[PDB]
Design a protein around this ligand. Structure first.
Ligand SMILES: *[C@@H]1O[C@H](CO)[C@@H](O)[C@H](O)[C@H]1NC(C)=O
Ligand SMILES: *[C@@H]1O[C@H](CO)[C@@H](O)[C@H](O)[C@H]1NC(C)=O
Ligand SMILES: O=C(O)[C@H]1O[C@@H](O)[C@H](O)[C@@H](O)[C@H]1O
Ligand SMILES: [Cl-]
Ligand code: NA
Length: 333
């Protein structure tokens, strides 16, 4: 019931208590854990991934009701051996995602250090899944702007809570791409592209999202809802921003747009956005001098969007094209 190598990992069936020791995952291998239902998995060392040619995920854990106790240990992706400024768009192969977490349970207190590109992929789930007190430290990727597409958390799942986490990276802190009942609370995001829903692709539906209590600094965007211009049979519905404190934003404090991968222009109509609110505690956003405060670029948006608790200052005014939605309240124009 102690995993000391990639081959030990296949031998944990029957273990209600697994200890994950530190070791290196050699080139050409992956670490896959399928723990027993309700098992506790406790990390007792750091896991380092030698430079590899495999596609990600390099680490996959999949189980029901798992209790993962990280004890502040590290999954080290050796990302600087791969980073070339091009991420997953071109250039060197980047194993991605680094980690994949599937099923359900509670995952606490570990660090992902220097992922090659996207760090933690979440989903699908079979019950609630909570990630609590995880650090994605890709800060080294800022050097010479070589880290790219280093998303903290990519979520395509239902019934997820991500709380008390820290992300230092070069792309979305979180990107919520699909699923219902997703809560992102009391996290700290710096260096990247902010807190995102999307990009929303054809057939994907994000609903009942709560973005609460987070701090975002030194980022390209504060919060975004982005849908591919071309997406159809897609939607975002029921999003509440509450109590977020954001500053140091370079491009847009808020960008809600159906023109992706562009920020604005000829927005699509097949990924309707509805019921997007800034309520509860104040969401205060300070943007840089050349930044835009708030832009909404809808081809198809509906509802009474209560933005009473949003305050955005700095930079210049954006544009509001909200289609059928009525945006009330707040301070940003
Ligand atoms: C990738 O970069 C190479 C040059 O470094 C360029 O030839 C190629 O067209 C780029 N990839 C794509 C898909 O455009
Ligand atoms: C998981 O999500 C789906 C849709 O949100 C739902 O039917 C199921 O009730 C949720 N389960 C739990 C345990 O929250
Ligand atoms: O934030 C974004 O949407 C985009 O940022 C760009 O810098 C990146 O090259 C894209 O792949 C996408 O991640
Ligand atoms: Cl290899
Ligand atoms: Na995803």
């Amino acid at each position: 019931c102690t995993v000391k190598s990639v081959d030990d990992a296949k031998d944990i069936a029957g273990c209600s208590a697994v200890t994950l020791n530190g070791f290196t995952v050699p080139a050409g291998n992956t670490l896959v854990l399928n723990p027993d239902k309700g098992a506790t998995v406790t990390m007792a060392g750091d896991i380092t991934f030698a430079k590899t040619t495999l596609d990600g995920p390099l680490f996959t854990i999949d189980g029901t009701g798992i209790n993962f106790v990280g004890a502040d240990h590290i999954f080290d992706g050796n990302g600087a051996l791969y980073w070339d400024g091009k991420g997953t768009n071109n250039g060197t192969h980047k194993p991605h995602p680094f980690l994949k977490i599937k099923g359900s349970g509670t995952y606490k207190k570990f660090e992902v250090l220097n992922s090659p590109a996207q760090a933690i992929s979440v989903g699908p789930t079979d019950a609630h899944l909570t990630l609590d007190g995880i650090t994605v430290d890709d800060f080294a990727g800022d050097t010479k702007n070589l880290g790219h597409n280093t998303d903290g958390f990519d979520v395509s799942a239902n019934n997820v809570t991500i709380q008390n986490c820290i992300v230092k990276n070069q792309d979305d802190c979180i990107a919520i791409n699909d699923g219902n009942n997703i809560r992102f609370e009391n996290n700290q995001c710096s260096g990247g592209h902010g807190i995102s829903i999307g990009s929303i692709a054809t057939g994907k539906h994000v609903s009942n999202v709560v973005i609460k209590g987070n701090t975002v600094t030194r980022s390209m965007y504060g919060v975004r809802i982005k849908a591919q211009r071309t997406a159809t049979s897609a939607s975002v519905s029921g999003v509440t921003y509450d109590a977020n404190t954001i500053s140091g934003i370079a491009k847009y404090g808020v960008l809600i747009s159906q023109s992706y991968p562009d920020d604005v222009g000829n927005p699509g109509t097949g990924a309707p956005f509805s019921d997007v609110n800034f309520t509860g505690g104040a969401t205060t956003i300070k943007v840089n001098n050349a930044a835009t405060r708030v832009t909404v670029e809808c081809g198809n948006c509906s509802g009474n969007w209560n933005w009473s608790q949003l305050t955005v200052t700095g930079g210049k005014a954006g544009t509001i094209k909200s289609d059928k939605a009525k945006i009330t309240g707040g301070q940003y124009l």
